Amino acid sequence: MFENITAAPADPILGLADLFRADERPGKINLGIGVYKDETGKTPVLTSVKKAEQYLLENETTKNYLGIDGIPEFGRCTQELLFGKGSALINDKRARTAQTPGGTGALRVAADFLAKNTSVKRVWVSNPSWPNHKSVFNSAGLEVREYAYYDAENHTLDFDALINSLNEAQAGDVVLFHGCCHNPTGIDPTLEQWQTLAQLSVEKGWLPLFDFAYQGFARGLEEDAEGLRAFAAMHKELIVASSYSKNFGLYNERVGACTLVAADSETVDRAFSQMKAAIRANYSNPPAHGASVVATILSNDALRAIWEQELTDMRQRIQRMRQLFVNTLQEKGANRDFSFIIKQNGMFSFSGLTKEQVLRLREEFGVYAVASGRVNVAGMTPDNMAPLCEAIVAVL
Amino acid sequence: MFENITAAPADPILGLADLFRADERPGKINLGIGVYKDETGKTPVLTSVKKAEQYLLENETTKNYLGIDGIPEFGRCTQELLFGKGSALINDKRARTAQTPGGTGALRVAADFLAKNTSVKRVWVSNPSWPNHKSVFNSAGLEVREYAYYDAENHTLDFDALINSLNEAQAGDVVLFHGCCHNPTGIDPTLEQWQTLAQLSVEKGWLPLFDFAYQGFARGLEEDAEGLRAFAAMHKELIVASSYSKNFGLYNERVGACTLVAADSETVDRAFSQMKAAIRANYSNPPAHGASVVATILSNDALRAIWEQELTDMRQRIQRMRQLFVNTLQEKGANRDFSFIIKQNGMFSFSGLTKEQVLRLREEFGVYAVASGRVNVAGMTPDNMAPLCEAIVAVL
Ligand SMILES: Cc1ncc(COP(=O)(O)O)c(CN[C@@H](CCC(=O)O)C(=O)O)c1O
Numbered sequence: 001m002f003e004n005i006t007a008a009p010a011d012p013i014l015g016l017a018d019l020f021r022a023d024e025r026p027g028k029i030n031l032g033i034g035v036y037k038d039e040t041g042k043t044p045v046l047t048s049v050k051k052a053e054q055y056l057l058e059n060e061t062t063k064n065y066l067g068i069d070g071i072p073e074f075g076r077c078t079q080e081l082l083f084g085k086g087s088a089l090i091n092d093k094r095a096r097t098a099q100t101p102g103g104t105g106a107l108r109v110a111a112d113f114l115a116k117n118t119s120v121k122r123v124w125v126s127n128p129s130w131p132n133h134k135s136v137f138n139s140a141g142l143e144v145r146e147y148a149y150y151d152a153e154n155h156t157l158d159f160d161a162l163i164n165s166l167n168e169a170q171a172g173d174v175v176l177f178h179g180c181c182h183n184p185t186g187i188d189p190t191l192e193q194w195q196t197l198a199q200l201s202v203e204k205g206w207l208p209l210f211d212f213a214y215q216g217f218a219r220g221l222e223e224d225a226e227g228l229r230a231f232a233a234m235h236k237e238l239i240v241a242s243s244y245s246k247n248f249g250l251y252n253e254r255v256g257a258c259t260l261v262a263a264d265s266e267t268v269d270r271a272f273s274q275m276k277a278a279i280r281a282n283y284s285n286p287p288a289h290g291a292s293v294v295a296t297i298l299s300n301d302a303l304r305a306i307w308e309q310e311l312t313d314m315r316q317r318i319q320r321m322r323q324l325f326v327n328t329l330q331e332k333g334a335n336r337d338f339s340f341i342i343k344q345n346g347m348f349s350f351s352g353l354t355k356e357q358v359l360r361l362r363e364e365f366g367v368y369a370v371a372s373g374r375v376n377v378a379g380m381t382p383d384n385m386a387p388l389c390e391a392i393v394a395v396l
Numbered sequence: 397m398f399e400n401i402t403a404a405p406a407d408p409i410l411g412l413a414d415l416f417r418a419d420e421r422p423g424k425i426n427l428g429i430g431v432y433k434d435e436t437g438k439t440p441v442l443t444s445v446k447k448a449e450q451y452l453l454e455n456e457t458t459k460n461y462l463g464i465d466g467i468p469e470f471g472r473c474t475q476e477l478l479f480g481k482g483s484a485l486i487n488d489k490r491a492r493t494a495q496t497p498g499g500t501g502a503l504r505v506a507a508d509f510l511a512k513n514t515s516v517k518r519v520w521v522s523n524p525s526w527p528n529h530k531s532v533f534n535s536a537g538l539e540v541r542e543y544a545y546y547d548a549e550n551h552t553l554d555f556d557a558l559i560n561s562l563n564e565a566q567a568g569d570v571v572l573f574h575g576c577c578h579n580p581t582g583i584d585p586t587l588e589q590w591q592t593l594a595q596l597s598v599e600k601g602w603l604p605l606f607d608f609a610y611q612g613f614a615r616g617l618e619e620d621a622e623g624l625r626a627f628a629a630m631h632k633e634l635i636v637a638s639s640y641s642k643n644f645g646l647y648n649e650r651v652g653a654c655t656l657v658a659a660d661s662e663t664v665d666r667a668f669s670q671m672k673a674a675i676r677a678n679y680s681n682p683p684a685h686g687a688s689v690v691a692t693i694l695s696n697d698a699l700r701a702i703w704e705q706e707l708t709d710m711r712q713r714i715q716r717m718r719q720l721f722v723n724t725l726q727e728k729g730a731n732r733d734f735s736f737i738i739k740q741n742g743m744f745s746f747s748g749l750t751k752e753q754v755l756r757l758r759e760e761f762g763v764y765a766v767a768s769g770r771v772n773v774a775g776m777t778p779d780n781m782a783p784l785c786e787a788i789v790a791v792l
């Protein structure tokens with residue numbers, strides 16, 4: 001029966017990573033997958049995390065199953081991060097949070113939930129966007145439409161095109177938004193634009209779904225959440241999928257959360273029970289380690305202070321690389337202006353290099369980037385910057 | 397959008413745990429969830445596990461993503477346990493293993509794999525069986541059919557009712573088999589019966605799906621895989637969803653595996669690519685901590701030894717309670733023969749109690765068991781045995 005199966009293509013992202021491991025020539029440079037790297041080019045485990053892990057090793061007395069929705073404290077802490085310590089949504093108990101295996105996992109349970117318990121038939125995602133967004137919703141049988149986002153001429157947010165593009169999104173339609181650090185453009189709406197979108201959203205009857213994979217990598221923890229909070233004060237219902245993979249360096253421990261918000265405590269609880277049924281029929285209950293670490297850090301004032309410092313250093317090193325990248329491009333002889341790179345937020349920068357050029361950099365200079373022209377700025381170091389910039393100039 | 401969602405009923409197994417946790421009677425007895433407990437009534441972390449976590453804590457340099465199918469060694473180690481060191485399935489490179497979030501996760505990925513890449517429409521599940529088996533498969537769009545299995549009156553396997561029922565399984569249909577320690581009956585087929593089912597399986601043309609959640613709790617590692625190894629040596633294709641939750645006591649770390657077997661190496665690889673695609677659109681990549689622990693224990697001879705020793709102590713402590721349970725029931729005045737409980741395998745026992753009796757046990761004596769009358773022998777200790785048997789006799 002397996003002879004009739006047609007092979008699946010390779011992940012445009014995850015795929016690339018196996019080729020890099022395959023590449024034999026010395027000097028290779030990996031600017032693909034979005035993982036943080038320090039000056040030495042390594043993806044270390046944070047000190048705050050090693051601390052928490054030692055604490056768990058000393059005090060865990062059992063590995064007994066967690067509830068379907070995971071660690072209680074985990075949910076409370078994420079709700080504060082997202083909505084604010086004294087949020088009204090929290091005080092009125094309008095939100096429930098389920099611990100999931102990564103942000104991907106939060107997007108999937110949200111999708112299974114919507115497919116089986118609502119009349120939602122369509123989800124609108126931006127173009128471009130993280131490739132896996134479409135695969136996640138399709139797996140639940142939801143049709144996925146796309147709206148305009150990037151102005152490739154001005155390297156800015158094409159707001160007028162975005163608004164017009166969404167004119168055909170109906171009441172009951174789900175509309176996906178990147179909380180901050182849009183992947184892959186790096187362009188986020190301003191507070192004013194968010195507020196406008198918030199208003200248009202209510203008037204149109206959309207169900208907002210926020211994907212928050214980089215809280216803290218743009219301006220800061222509180223700042224990066226302004227868009228969402230402007231939506232939260234305007235909406236009755238909304239969903240948010242968050243990930244702690246990047247801001248805690250916990251990638252392989254799959255720590256994330258899916259937060260449900262309804263009009264009142266009674267409705268959200270009723271809806272949440274169904275979200276749990278969807279989880280039960282998927283993986284039954286969430287992996288404890290990663291979430292234990294995060295909850296331990298967010299709850300301890302000493303660990304928390306350390307972690308915040310580590311996130312700040314991660315954020316600043318990336319911005320520093322953005323500057324050094326643009327400067328070195330000039331010094332190496334690039335006539336194309338790359339100034340826009342400094343205005344982008346987060347790990348990824350939309351270089352604007354053509355698929356052809358990307359393939360040339362890979363097979364001819366040993367430099368890897370996603371075929372969309374997206375390049376990981378977090379992967380740039382003082383040591384590979386020159387070789388990197390020199391290659392790009394060559395393909396220009 | 398959420399106003400009309402109808403609440404979900406509690407999970408027949410997990411729901412119980414929440415009621416038990418809430419019950420204020422100081423003498424409560426939990427015999428529901430299938431979790432192990434030592435002579436003192438606690439669910440400890442194995443010593444082998446604790447040692448591995450220590451190694452991990454002091455040697456992990458990064459938390460970088462694992463890759464869709466997980467830790468490679470992990471995959472190789474589970475294939476030898478399932479098939480045997482020198483299996484031909486391994487040599488001919490006919491099997492592909494993907495690390496999944498628990499056995500439940502292994503069941504869902506397999507279900508999504510089948511429904512999205514083949515013609516499979518129906519799934520055959522023993523009657524009775526683990527309640528969540530239907531939820532998992534129905535969620536992937538697969539229809540679920542049940543086949544006779546248990547002889548109520550004789551408290552045995554109705555091999556005649558079984559084979560007559562399965563005569564209705566058309567070719568291409570999927571038939572679920574519990575590797576060993578059937579849930580909830582505890583009655584497994586003898587090798588002879590496995591032999592038969594295997595040959596009849598190839599004749600009727602079914603795709604065998606094995607749920608292996610208790611390797612090591614019936615007789616032993618090798619002994620427990622006998623039925624599977626018999627199917628293996630005879631079929632061209634089969635799927636095995638296994639769990640490390642129990643035999644490693646890693647319940648909340650979600651450690652499982654989904655193994656695909658095809659006719660040859662090119663076919664399994666082609667089919668395995670779609671499985672990875674199914675995974676990518678679910679949780680992206682598996683949780684590293686628990687699987688890492690399993691991998692390091694199984695790879696280190698000095699740790700393996702300790703682990704097998706610990707597994708044996710658990711299997712033996714459960715046999716001693718099964719006997720003690722039957723002896724005590726007579727002593728406290730039972731007007732019946734529960735001798736049929738010594739023939740059952742694993743952690744559970746199909747007591748014979750009715751829903752109403754199971755209910756009274758909870759309501760009046762604070763003794764918790766599954767409504768189907770399933771009881772966790774592994775939750776019985778020398779200390780709670782007496783109170784426990786008095787309650788049953790009283791409701792008898
Ligand atoms: C918008 C966005 N959403 C969700 C996720 C998923 O988060 P997890 O916690 O890993 O589930 C990522 C990670 N995207 C990175 C990492 C690799 C990948 O998963 O593609 C990237 O864009 O290369 C992301 O960029």
Ligand SMILES: Cc1ncc(COP(=O)(O)O)c(CN[C@@H](CCC(=O)O)C(=O)O)c1O
Nearest residue numbers: 284409429430498499500526579609639641
């Ligand atoms: C036949 C069977 N298959 C799969 C699983 C899934 O194992 P995980 O690795 O935990 O995903 C269990 C656990 N059944 C136990 C535990 C609680 C539950 O999952 O219902 C029980 O039936 O009490 C099981 O009995």
